[PDB]
Write a protein that binds this ligand. Structure first.
Ligand SMILES: *[C@@H]1O[C@H](CO)[C@@H](O[C@@H]2O[C@H](CO)[C@@H](O[C@@H]3O[C@H](CO[C@H]4O[C@H](CO)[C@@H](O)[C@H](O)[C@@H]4O)[C@@H](O)[C@H](O)[C@@H]3O)[C@H](O)[C@H]2NC(C)=O)[C@H](O)[C@H]1NC(C)=O
Ligand SMILES: *[C@@H]1O[C@H](CO)[C@@H](O[C@@H]2O[C@H](CO)[C@@H](O[C@@H]3O[C@H](CO[C@H]4O[C@H](CO)[C@@H](O)[C@H](O)[C@@H]4O)[C@@H](O)[C@H](O)[C@@H]3O)[C@H](O)[C@H]2NC(C)=O)[C@H](O)[C@H]1NC(C)=O
Ligand SMILES: *[C@@H]1O[C@H](CO)[C@@H](O[C@@H]2O[C@H](CO)[C@@H](O[C@@H]3O[C@H](CO)[C@@H](O)[C@H](O)[C@@H]3O)[C@H](O)[C@H]2NC(C)=O)[C@H](O)[C@H]1NC(C)=O
Ligand SMILES: *[C@@H]1O[C@H](CO)[C@@H](O[C@@H]2O[C@H](CO)[C@@H](O)[C@H](O)[C@H]2NC(C)=O)[C@H](O)[C@H]1NC(C)=O
Ligand SMILES: *[C@@H]1O[C@H](CO)[C@@H](O[C@@H]2O[C@H](CO)[C@@H](O)[C@H](O)[C@H]2NC(C)=O)[C@H](O)[C@H]1NC(C)=O
Ligand SMILES: *[C@@H]1O[C@H](CO)[C@@H](O[C@@H]2O[C@H](CO)[C@@H](O)[C@H](O)[C@H]2NC(C)=O)[C@H](O)[C@H]1NC(C)=O
Ligand code: NAG
Ligand code: NAG
Ligand code: NAG
Ligand code: NAG
Ligand code: NAG
Ligand code: NAG
Ligand code: NAG
Ligand code: MAN
Lengths: 245, 49, 127, 244, 49, 49
């Protein structure tokens, strides 16, 4: 899976990246793939994984803890259309389960407790495989749809992800990868001058706090900021007027 | 502000009327005119030197 | 300048203070990019008091003890003597870390060039 | 000739003479402050003089005799319909104005019996008060209460005998800004006037000049002074652009 | 004489009534913080520091 | 006085606290307790406020 991680190198880390800089990226992401056509992928873990698909088949992901009473859940469909669109909703339901096999524009529950809704446009710009997953921690929900990262602050008491494919195809093959992450992996970005793999030199690390060396963290050796340090974020504090030179 | 309200002149004329703001701005004038002669005499020291 | 959605429906804070002798202030913010930011001086959001507008590129908060709330250097509004800060904010980088310093006043020289600090120098030794 | 009048000589030696121009007279105003939700008050000082017992011999009235015939009150305007009178309002709002309106009871508006305000100790005259002045606290009074500075109140505008003072209490700050003409409705204060000689009032700084717009971004506070306390540039808060 | 203020809100310092004091300079009256009683001599010459 | 105006004293106007004010000088007698006056003016040698 070097090329598949090498495809993960290209599209997934082209979310934000500016030039000539390195950091210490930690996001719970892929390590080893899984292909599943069970169509009721009931799996309970501690964070989301990432899926991957090129063909024109609808998808549906549901995120919850247990069946709560006001703690909101996540509903989401990835449906093929004239443009393959995706809507994510944050609301609540007691009845039902995904053994469904219907059409799914907006189809799971009209919950009366619903606050967030957005119809995202999936940028299927590249012809290769591009990754789209999610993340939550405790109050803090992540979206990785298309070209950006969007954040939702609600609450996360979430340990059961519900994924399913709702169609009875007779015998088809699916180039189709989906993982489920319950890990705390770390990485080490580079992009010094360009290692020409595409632009960078990745490094996964084994245990903890690797050779990434974020320049924001320092050691206050005497109560003193170290010399030779970027003050891009420390300011002169005043109230009358700032200086210029 | 040489014993006056504020160190800028247009602040003075937007608080007081002309019959009484002139006394306040007078201390600005005679104060600043002495500040030139402190500069001028230092300069003519150097021109002659 | 992390601009995300705040779908609280609980009247959340996004910034919560505790003054001396058990008094609560809770300020929130929105966007338009300007920053509409209101306050509460109560236990719940019983009203709203308009703070101001923060400029679009915020890159330093600073909370002094007496009640000074510096933003980007400038003192935008004073407040009460602060005991503790209950916060929930993020940054648009998804890469590294922040820094939250605990800091004392100290006389220093600064090098300013285009209103940003170039080089710092301390004054502690007799030399 | 302006060079000659500055030189006190009818004939000049040929050379270099620092000359300039008298600027203008009428300039469009310009007032920029931190944006705030409007809360504008309208307090007026109202003086009524009893002229029904003392028809046409009020010019012979002694100084404490007008104090019995005086009527001093602050007509604070409610935003519902009419006005309410008080004795000593002290403002908690954000924008306010002081207006003055004296009425004799029987058409006696001649020179020999007026009333007009007089700055006595305050560092602002009352007929300049409706310009963009900035305070922290501001509380008025008509009695001999807590002394701040006090305004006089004179009868004959030739022979200025006094009735009773209007003392004001104040300290400098930026939470209270006076407005002359009730900028209501807008949650933004405006009139950046570009490319001409204006008169500005920017965040409390004041003076005349030409304001332009530029494409350069500085991550800093609101404004940028010189070494002499003059404005060089300032930043709008609602957007990112700075002016010069 | 001169007068001291007396404020209510230590944010919004509105005033009740002043405490005016009347005074002139001299040496017969000396303020003491902590009631030096009993002694007919005032002290605390502290040497060599 | 906080007995007529429980917890809304922060909404009280400026002369309204003057009715609720109580200003006095508790001059201490050297025998036992204290006496209240309105305006003492000192004749003694040492004092403290
Ligand atoms: C950074 O600046 C801070 C100032 O804002 C420094 O905080 C100061 O820290 C010192 C040392 O911890 C405190 O002084 C101590 O206070 C305790 C308790 O005070 C009470 O009792 C003392 C007499 O015992 C009396 O003088 C006080 O008024 C109180 O009644 C004392 O037991 C100690 O003897 C000593 O006085 C300061 O009080 C504190 N500032 C305040 C006002 O809280 C901080 O230390 C600095 N950090 C640095 C420079 O590294
Ligand atoms: C600040 O408060 C002042 C006190 O109210 C405001 O003055 C008021 O301005 C309005 C403008 O519409 C006046 O209304 C007009 O009244 C005239 C006739 O005035 C005479 O008759 C009225 C009868 O009610 C009487 O109240 C006046 O005193 C006069 O005797 C009409 O012809 C107009 O159509 C209109 O109705 C108020 O009369 C006037 N009140 C006073 C006491 O002067 C002032 O405008 C406020 N300033 C602001 C908001 O900037
Ligand atoms: C969240 O992930 C962690 C670790 O990634 C989960 O730990 C799971 O831990 C068990 C041990 O309790 C591992 O099973 C081991 O399996 C081998 C193979 O049969 C067996 O010989 C050992 O005796 C032991 O049973 C399991 O592999 C590991 N699973 C994963 C996901 O790596 C933890 O359970 C996860 N949260 C859940 C789903 O509760
Ligand atoms: C909805 O239906 C699915 C599929 O039947 C249920 O998933 C099962 O969950 C149990 C308990 O965790 C597992 O032991 C099974 O292996 C899962 N799959 C199957 C095929 O049984 C899911 O729990 C149901 N959710 C409900 C009823 O709310
Ligand atoms: C990323 O890779 C580059 C080289 O491709 C590293 O650059 C070298 O860094 C060391 C110190 O870590 C320097 O002594 C070398 O001089 C650098 N080489 C160059 C090209 O000048 C870079 O350090 C790596 N990332 C990090 C931050 O470790
Ligand atoms: C620090 O200050 C110097 C002096 O103003 C800046 O140097 C100027 O840089 C620009 C672009 O690099 C040139 O066009 C000027 O000619 C330079 N000035 C001189 C006198 O040569 C320098 O850019 C500043 N550093 C910053 C803004 O980061
Ligand atoms: C790295 O190599 C690639 C070739 O795939 C080239 O396109 C790119 O410009 C190179 N980058 C640098 C910095 O030389
Ligand atoms: C709560 O406030 C009171 C007075 O307002 C104070 O004395 C106390 O220390 C505070 N903290 C507690 C009870 O933890
Ligand atoms: C302050 O933070 C603590 C710990 O996170 C939390 O339990 C408490 O609810 C917070 N207080 C608020 C939100 O008022
Ligand atoms: C405004 O309200 C007051 C009571 O608060 C009332 O006395 C007055 O008549 C009202 N004025 C109008 C015209 O609404
Ligand atoms: C307001 O005017 C009325 C009518 O003359 C008068 O009775 C009342 O005393 C005035 N109130 C004040 C506070 O001056
Ligand atoms: C002190 O003497 C006064 C009378 O001069 C008396 O009223 C007061 O009670 C005495 N106090 C004590 C406790 O001796
Ligand atoms: C002293 O206190 C008593 C008890 O309240 C009061 O009656 C008396 O008027 C006060 N005297 C002075 C001079 O304030
Ligand atoms: O005082 C302003 C006044 O000046 C003169 C003319 O320009 C008028 O048209 C103008 O209104």
């Amino acid at each position: 899976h070097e090329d598949n991680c090498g495809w993960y190198n290209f599209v997934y880390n082209n979310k934000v990246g500016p030039n000539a800089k390195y950091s210490y990226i930690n996001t719970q992401n892929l390590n080893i793939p899984n292909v599943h056509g069970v169509y009721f992928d009931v799996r309970e873990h501690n964070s989301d994984g990432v899926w991957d698909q090129i063909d024109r088949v609808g998808l549906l992901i549901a995120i919850h803890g247990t069946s709560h009473y006001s703690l909101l859940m996540v509903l989401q469909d990835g449906v093929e259309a004239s443009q393959p669109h995706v809507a994510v909703k944050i609301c609540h339901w007691n009845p039902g389960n995904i053994s469904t096999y219907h059409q799914f524009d907006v189809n799971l529950g009209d919950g009366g407790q619903c606050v967030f809704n957005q119809r995202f446009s999936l940028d299927t710009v590249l012809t290769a495989n591009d990754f789209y997953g999610f993340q939550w921690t405790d109050t803090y929900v992540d979206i990785y749809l298309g070209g950006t990262i969007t954040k939702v602050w609600v609450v996360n008491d979430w340990s059961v992800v519900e994924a399913s494919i709702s169609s009875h195809w007779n015998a088809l093959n699916y180039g189709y990868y989906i993982q489920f992450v319950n890990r705390t992996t770390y990485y080490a970005y580079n992009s010094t001058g360009g290692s020409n793999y595409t632009h960078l030199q990745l490094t996964e690390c084994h245990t903890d706090y690797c050779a990434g060396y974020a320049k924001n963290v320092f050691v206050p050796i005497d109560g003193k900021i170290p010399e030779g340090f970027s003050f891009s974020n420390w300011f002169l504090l005043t109230d009358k007027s700032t200086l210029v030179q | 502000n040489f014993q006056a309200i504020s160190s800028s002149i247009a602040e003075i004329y937007n608080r007081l009327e002309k019959v009484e703001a002139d006394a306040q701005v007078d201390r600005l004038i005679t104060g600043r005119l002495a500040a030139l002669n402190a500069y001028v005499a230092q300069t003519l020291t150097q021109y002659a030197e | 300048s992390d601009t995300d959605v705040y779908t609280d429906s609980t009247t959340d804070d996004q910034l919560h203070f505790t003054f001396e002798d058990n008094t609560t202030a809770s300020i929130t913010c929105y966007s338009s990019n300007s920053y509409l930011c209101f306050a509460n001086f109560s236990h719940s959001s019983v009203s709203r008091q308009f703070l101001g507008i923060l400029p679009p590129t915020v890159r330093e908060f600073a909370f002094g003890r007496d009640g000074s709330i510096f933003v980007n250097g400038y003192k935008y509004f004073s407040l009460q003597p602060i005991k503790s800060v209950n916060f929930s904010i993020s940054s648009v980088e998804n890469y590294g870390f922040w820094t939250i310093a605990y800091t004392n006043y100290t006389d220093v020289m600064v090098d300013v060039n285009g209103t940003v600090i170039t080089r710092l120098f301390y004054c502690d030794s007799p030399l | 000739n302006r060079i000659k009048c500055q030189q006190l000589k009818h004939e000049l030696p040929d050379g270099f003479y620092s000359a300039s121009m008298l600027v203008k007279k009428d300039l469009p105003k310009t007032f920029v402050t931190m944006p705030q939700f409007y809360n504008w008050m309208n307090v007026t000082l109202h003086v009524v003089l009893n002229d029904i017992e003392k028809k046409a011999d009020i010019i012979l009235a002694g100084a404490p005799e007008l104090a019995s015939l005086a009527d001093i009150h602050f007509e604070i305007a409610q935003a519902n319909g009419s006005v309410v009178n008080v004795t000593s309002v002290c403002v908690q709002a954000r924008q306010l104005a002081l207006f003055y309106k004296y009425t004799s009871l029987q058409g006696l508006y001649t020179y020999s019996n007026l009333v007009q305000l007089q700055n006595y100790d305050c560092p602002f005259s009352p007929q300049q008060f409706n310009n963009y002045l900035q305070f922290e606290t501001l509380c008025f009074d008509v009695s001999p209460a807590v002394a701040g500075c006090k305004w006089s109140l004179v009868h004959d505008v030739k022979w200025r005998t006094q009735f009773a003072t209007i003392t004001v209490s104040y300290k400098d700050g930026a939470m209270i800004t006076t407005m002359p003409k009730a900028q209501l409705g807008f949650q933004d204060i405006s009139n950046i006037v570009k490319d001409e000689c204006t008169d500005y009032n920017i965040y409390g700084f004041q003076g005349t000049g030409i304001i332009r717009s530029t494409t350069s971004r500085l991550v800093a506070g609101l404004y940028y002074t010189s070494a002499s306390g003059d404005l060089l540039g300032f930043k709008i808060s609602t957007t990112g652009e700075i002016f010069t």
